[PDB]
């Protein structure tokens, strides 16, 4: 009844709210703080957990969204806006939520964190294409999904610094995979059994929890949808990280003119800026001309991560670990329109060879000439090497491959070589209701709404067939979360998943099709990023 | 009658032999003399014209084979020994043949000039697979052949040097085109319309006289099969001729010590020796382990070649020329038996991968190893990087595109894109009689049987269907040379052959089957070849 709205957990009482389902009700449990507000002198400083509360801490809506650039390229466009915040902006927003079944489960259940994307510098748990309430229904899975600090006030770092140190956003994650364990029982869910998953800058940051020895207790298995921690925008250098930090200071007005310029006297400069002042200067810090290039991501100072995720992904054990692992078919199509020359989501944006040729410097920035030229030579079909319909796919493979595929795709062989049982998958189903250009495919991100169960809601347009592709999807992530293992485990009548190996290459096709096998995740173009491109940069 | 058999030429009158085939007779002038032997004091010189000679010059057998190495990789064995000298050696070889229809043509007739290959060190007219009699009557044309010099005795230069310029083997072939020019009238044959075709080292010396403009007037077409004049094997530089020149007179105790070592003297000695003595040692020249290189070849001085053949094709005018261009389908898989580690005729060549690699620096000599990663990045299978028979395959394509295929695919661009009509074919049946083993395929040299009319012979086990198909590819041939198109100039019947364009790339498959018409010379992989590498060259 009304009783089950009512939790305690360590830091005292809350009081969650019933959703509807087509199917069933859900209690949700919205807004339960986890840590201290980290504002005023706590801006740049890992969280502190949240004291004890009085009373009864109401949880029946999504409280305030994380500081953040809010995008303006497309103003109304819904492709646009649905990422973008919608509660208000704050310095205190380090709250999370927590999904469970109705009746609340009697046995512990399986627990799925779920950590947003939005490339370290956007995201919020509030999202509505994160909505909880259809995956708890369908698979009686206990879910949780919390909000972390993001852009400057999550990862400006000055490396050796204490008072910057970098990486708190990652921090913020941590903290609540420390609140799950010590609360998330109370809510009816196993602390023995929790399964990360996250979407792009989400999934390099399951990723990097995987990597980071702290974090690795806390969790068992994980999925990494369209990201990895290897990616080459995931992670800084500490010369470059300090860089970007004495910019954004210098942009703002710091330090004053006549002031010296040391560690401490920067931050303190910084703290007594507004947050949104901080926000506006934000993209002026980027090096060059580029997309898919983020100003204040996770640095590798030696705390967090021990060495680079590449050099922690090749000497790691994975023995006793299942992950999930993927990308959806148009990993590129996406970011061409925030930088790529002749790229337009409202025409076909049928670029030129000039074009294609200038794109590929956005698209892969800071690389040598001759660098540019191999991947240029990889990705011109010869026979029509200035189509524009073909260069335009090209430039968004090379977009995608370079930033998601060969990424993720170096990762899985890794893990499951080194101990870890693997599957992977490529999304190929285009929404019926995407309002992004048909050219642009099934661009990065456009899976979550399935995975999330969205086509159940009765107020959207989805077609029949995708609300059973959506439970179908919503049985292989829980099974994974169960078993780790997504087949359904009694049941021989579906076409198998397969574990993804290092030499057969083994993934499964997601669409409205049933399951079909293909080996290799673009292996040929992903040979050239992960073997050739090193090589060739480090002879200059 | 036998007074057909009775010829006067410029030099003097000739007795010729009649020739029979299933479809008649032909006539035939084996043996004329086209130049004073280069003998003594004449070695390494350029030919002098044969003076005039009294009486009747017998002209019924073929002539002696100039001194060349003879090939005994595998005695006994049909597929190497169909190739070697089939009369006695002797510097005394410059002997040009004349094929004319019997009854004699009446009306001028288009003359067929054919150079044998042989990677300019080896080679003769007078082998069975270059007899022309079937040619010659099937399609009623004339056809000449003539013995250049090879080795050493052709292609030793010392560049700058009198005594020893170079080139003097394509200088012979010159001057059989002069002697066509001034006698061919007397067969019958049209001297304005002389079509020269040729095979691998053929084929380059054919692209040489169209480079070489006091030979590009003695003719009016070209046919260059499976080889190019641009190839990677086909010229050397004078540095490094010089250098050759200089080690094989090392190694026949040239200059005796302790003499100087100037170029006249150096020659002085080099022609006191025996011409077996500079042949038994014409492969200890070459710089390091290979296939596909050659010691003594033309050398680029200046004179012959004006500059590079690659220059020269890029700069030049070729409007008012038509071109028959063409590979077979696997050009490298001959080649590999001649230095490819775990290779070998009589097994089927299942190499390792680590077998593979180093066969990729014999394939790719004098290459950095960065070089040879690009290489083997663009020719493994990254879904099966140790499966040997694909690892077989490829290491035969690499051979084949560097050496063959996309040499001559960059001179049929530029030639189309700059005035020539192009014609392209890939040839891609495999002999039933064929004692190379199975997996080489299609090998280098295995089409020529088939544009000679071999099949036709009497004594020989070809099927029924090779007969057929070896007329139709003398029709070819003879339609190009009669008016510059192989298409039948009123026959709609069979599919018609495109020409051969810079954008549309068209070329048609040569096989059982009738034509198929299909795009690009291994496209993808010849952008590697001609466009990327020698970009990564440049930076070492
Ligand atoms: C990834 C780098 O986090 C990009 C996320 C972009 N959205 C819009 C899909 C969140
Ligand atoms: C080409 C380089 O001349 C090779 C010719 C080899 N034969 C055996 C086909 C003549």
Same mark, same amino acid.
């Given at each position: 009844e009304d009783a089950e709205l009512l939790v305690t957990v360590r830091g005292g009482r809350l009081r969650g709210i019933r959703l509807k389902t087509p199917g069933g009700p859900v209690s949700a449990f919205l807004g339960i703080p986890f840590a201290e507000p980290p504002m005023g002198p706590r801006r740049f400083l890992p969280p502190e957990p949240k004291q004890p509360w009085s009373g009864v801490v109401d949880?029946?809506?999504?409280?305030?969204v994380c500081y953040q650039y809010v995008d303006t390229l497309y103003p109304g466009f819904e492709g646009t806006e649905m990422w973008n915040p919608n509660r208000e902006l704050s310095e205190d927003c380090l709250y999370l939520n927590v999904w469970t079944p109705y009746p609340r489960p009697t046995s512990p259940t399986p627990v799925l964190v779920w950590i947003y994307g939005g490339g370290?510098?956007?995201?919020?748990?509030?999202?509505?294409?994160?909505?909880?309430?259809?995956?708890?229904?369908?698979?009686?899975?206990?879910?949780?999904?919390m909000?972390?600090?993001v852009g400057a006030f999550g990862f400006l770092a000055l490396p050796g610094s204490r008072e910057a140190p970098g990486n708190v956003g990652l921090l913020d994650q941590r903290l609540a995979l420390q609140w799950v364990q010590e609360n998330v029982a109370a809510f009816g869910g196993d602390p023995t059994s929790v399964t990360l998953f996250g979407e792009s800058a989400g999934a390099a940051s399951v990723g990097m929890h995987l990597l980071s020895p702290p974090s690795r207790g806390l969790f068992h298995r994980a999925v990494?949808?369209?990201? $990895?921690?290897?990616?080459?925008?995931?992670?800084?250098?500490?010369?470059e990280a300090r860089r970007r930090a004495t910019q954004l200071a210098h942009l703002v007005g710091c330090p004053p003119g006549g002031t010296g310029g040391n560690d401490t006297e920067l931050v303190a400069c910084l703290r007594t800026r507004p947050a949104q002042v901080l926000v506006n200067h934000e993209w002026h810090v980027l090096p060059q001309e580029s997309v898919f290039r983020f100003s204040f991501v996770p640095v590798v100072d030696g705390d967090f991560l021990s060495d680079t995720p590449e050099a922690?992904?090749? $000497?790691?054990?994975?023995?006793?670990?299942?992950?999930?692992?993927?990308?959806?078919?148009?990993?590129?199509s996406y970011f061409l329109v925030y930088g790529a020359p002749g790229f337009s989501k409202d025409n076909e944006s049928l670029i030129s060879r000039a074009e294609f040729l200038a794109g590929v410097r956005v698209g892969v920035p800071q690389v040598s000439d001759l660098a540019a030229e191999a991947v240029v030579l990889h990705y011109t079909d010869?026979?029509?090497?200035?189509?524009?319909?073909?260069?335009?796919?090209?430039?968004?493979?090379?977009?995608?491959?370079?930033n998601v595929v060969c990424p993720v795709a170096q990762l899985a062989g890794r893990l499951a070589a080194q101990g870890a049982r693997v599957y992977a998958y490529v999304f190929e189903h285009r929404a019926s209701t995407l309002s992004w250009p048909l050219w642009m495919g099934v661009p990065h991100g456009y899976e979550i709404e399935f995975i999330f169960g969205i086509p159940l809601d009765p107020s959207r347009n989805y077609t029949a067939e995708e609300k059973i592709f959506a439970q179908r999807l919503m049985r292989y992530w829980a099974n994974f979360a169960r078993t780790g293992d997504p087949n359904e485990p009694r049941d021989p009548?579906?076409?198998?998943?397969?574990?993804?190996?290092?030499?057969?290459?083994?993934?499964?096709? !997601?669409?409205?099709?049933?399951?079909?096998?293909?080996?290799?995740?673009? $292996?040929?173009?992903?040979?050239?990023?992960?073997?050739?491109?090193?090589?060739? !940069?480090?002879?200059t």
């Open positions: 949880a029946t809506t999504f409280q305030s370290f510098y956007s995201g919020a748990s509030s999202l509505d294409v994160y909505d909880g309430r259809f995956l708890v229904q369908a698979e009686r899975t206990v879910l949780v999904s909000n972390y600090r990494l949808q369209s990201g $990895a921690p290897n990616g080459p925008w995931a992670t800084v250098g500490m010369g922690l992904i090749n $000497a790691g054990d994975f023995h006793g670990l299942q992950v999930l692992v993927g990308v959806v078919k148009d990993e590129g010869w026979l029509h090497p200035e189509d524009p319909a073909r260069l335009r796919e090209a430039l968004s493979d090379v977009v995608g491959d370079h009548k579906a076409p198998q998943w397969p574990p993804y190996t290092a030499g057969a290459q083994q993934y499964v096709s !997601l669409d409205l099709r049933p399951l079909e096998v293909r080996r290799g995740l673009r $292996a040929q173009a992903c040979a050239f990023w992960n073997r050739f491109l090193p090589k060739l !940069l480090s002879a």
